[PDB]
């Protein structure tokens, strides 16, 4: 029993973090095989960071300008490549702790674990949802760029996020491991705003299924809705529209509870319109939206064969 | 920026986690040097678990009865003994990944990270506080016993919790690494109840101070209270009574912010009675009590030298 936002175990990732210093700017890199991946603004001065021309800045850098440290071992940089907003530093040594891994680009409403690092050294780990406005509500201080987000499936680490920056509102923006930003953001110190965040509807529905399984079911009703009619109400209340892809991932919970997705949608719709009127769901007056259908099935209480 | 319930990186603990099987009963063990620590109820059949005489049940077990797997490597048990509620299985191979470590008994109110494991495979990591009633509100399913709780101090792992059971309320109970239960619980399937789960008042207050440093102080007011009249309200809401000693603990944060502890108490009193009115504090719509007075400032935003 018990619902907790858990991160995946971070060990396979810890053995890949290094420190990357380019002159008087430092951040973290990810060391896989003989390549170290890091945010390209490691080549900037603080002044450069206002309006960098990264191609012009990189021309002035040589392999010797990059100092890469794996604990107490210096790795010699033998080539470098800018790819979108990440730098790929080829080093003379393959990382012996390289896990089986892939790079994947995640979608809003999906979760991943963040390993926050400073100076190449892992600091803490926590679970994030990619918000519909393509920011994450992380915890990140100066020097944390190059920290990565990931999911783990058996032994295979799927890297999906590299941290780059913090917006004026205190939320966080980064790239996938190919170096393309999530969202409309750029790695310059300019006045950028993230769009209005919206509630991740599929995750609230998963939460509601979890509530039913644990016996909390006052909010169920006998009403019917089309998906388009439900989505019109969702958009009014700044909830994300439910897609067929969301309906697919709610399949197992629907099957195990016998509540069709569109019936649980009609139940949510009444919640949005009428509020919760002093009732609670799973012991809270607020609807959770960062437990995915996968999270819910993994942690939900289960039947007991007696 | 950002404020998150963060756990320590779990890599140093992942390398210690093994599966222990005795008959058809399996759970996790902690492999340090040539010893595996696990909950003693691995020797029970399910029917044994109701009212076990552990001494009698252990007498009928031999070394050969314990199967230990570290990944694909089988670890043969070459001695065994019981210590309170844990077993120490001596194995033929010292763990080459043993970190620097110690066993420590934490206090109610203190925090620790949990590496939840099943079949000796680490599954997830999250941060918990030892509740005033000596329970933990974690996410644990069948087969998670033997999962451990820990803090990391640079390179040294302080193991402080080993998981054993779930009470009828869904809350979790366990032991230190010498096998002594936190709280009055016993490792048998009986009708046990924990004491009242109170909110950790000193932790909420430290969090309010961290809020002020970050710039959330909409809850600050000009009112002040005495310790007694605060505790009147505290008991009404099942907050721990605030002692003068707790008041002393908050001295440093009080000096950091210029805010008298009893003035912060006045703000907390008003928040308890009137709620937050749709405002949040450090991104939370609830009063957070899982951050210790030392831990809270580490995530605060800092001054920027311009
Ligand atoms: Na600088």
Author numbering:
A (entry chain B), B (entry chain A): 1 to 306
Paper lines:
The main protease of SARS-CoV-2 (Mpro, also referred to as 3-chymotrypsin-like protease or 3CLpro) is responsible for the majority of nsp processing, cleaving at 11 conserved sites along the polyprotein including self-excision of Mpro by autolytic cleavage of its own N-terminal and C-terminal autoprocessing sites. SARS-CoV-2 Mpro is a functional homodimer of two symmetrically disposed protomers that are each 306 residues in length (33.8 kDa). The active site of Mpro features a Cys145-His41 catalytic dyad, which orchestrates nucleophilic attack at the carbonyl carbon of the invariant P1 glutamine and the formation of an acyl enzyme intermediate central to efficient peptide cleavage. Using C-terminally substituted Mpro chimeras, we have determined X-ray crystallographic structures of Mpro in complex with 10 of its 11 viral cleavage sites, bound at full occupancy intermolecularly in trans, within the active site of either the native enzyme and/or a catalytic mutant (C145A).
